[PDB]
Amino acid sequence: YPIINFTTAGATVQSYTNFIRAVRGRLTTGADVRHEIPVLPNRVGLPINQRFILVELSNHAELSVTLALDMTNAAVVGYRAGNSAYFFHPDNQEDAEAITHLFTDVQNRYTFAFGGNYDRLEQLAGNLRENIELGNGPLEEAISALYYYSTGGTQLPTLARSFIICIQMISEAARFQYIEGEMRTRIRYNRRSAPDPSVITLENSWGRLSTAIQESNQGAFASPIQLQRRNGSKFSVYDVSILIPIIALMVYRCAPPPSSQF
């Protein structure tokens, strides 16, 4: 599986931008672009060889973890730390089989009894995303915490939190140039801060936004998607056009309709 390397140690907007673009690049098959927005490969019929990408994370503590990301949704499905691999509870038997092809050389393989969704992760962490700071510091700490879980030095809540940080700064950043931008700004000013309502609502609405765009009539949404701005004010999305600078990747939701060209 393709590997993308990133270190939080001395991370800059550029090195982070390079990292997200590389991840996004590996996530972009070029086979499916809907209104200038790449669509992630459909899960059905997707060969196991084309299923995962690896995100090797290093930090200032000289620790390394390797996150496995699912091509179909850019989601972290689990990670490797040393001779151990840890996987989120598979949502189905197909995914359960799929993950057996990840880190096949580790001595120890563990599947968490919990999934890698925010709701579960937030409950486990004892904190909502809103109250979990993001930035290079949080990610630096997330990597150490993920690594020390393999040596028994990390509690499950801190894990969870760490997963929440990693997912937003990697999976959501790849999915959204906007969220990438939010992370870039954090790094630019060494800012450590919880995601504002614009980041939260984009994350929550990623699937619905993907569906709305793919099911849109020439880009026009049949029904608006309610988002929030940075200040928390209601922002309604009626069209793909305003999402083009915002959403970088879509989860596959339907086949592109036969081109109805004028």
Numbering used by the authors: 6 to 267
Article passage:
Ricin is a heterodimeric ribosome-inactivating protein (RIP) that is available worldwide in ton quantities as a byproduct of castor-oil production from the plant Ricinus communis. RTA is an efficient N-glycosidase that catalyzes the hydrolysis of a specific adenine within the 28S rRNA of the 60S ribosomal subunit, leading to cell death. RiVax is a recombinant protein that is currently under clinical development as part of a human vaccine to protect against ricin poisoning. RiVax includes ricin A-chain (RTA) residues 1–267 with two intentional amino-acid substitutions, V76M and Y80A, aimed at reducing toxicity.
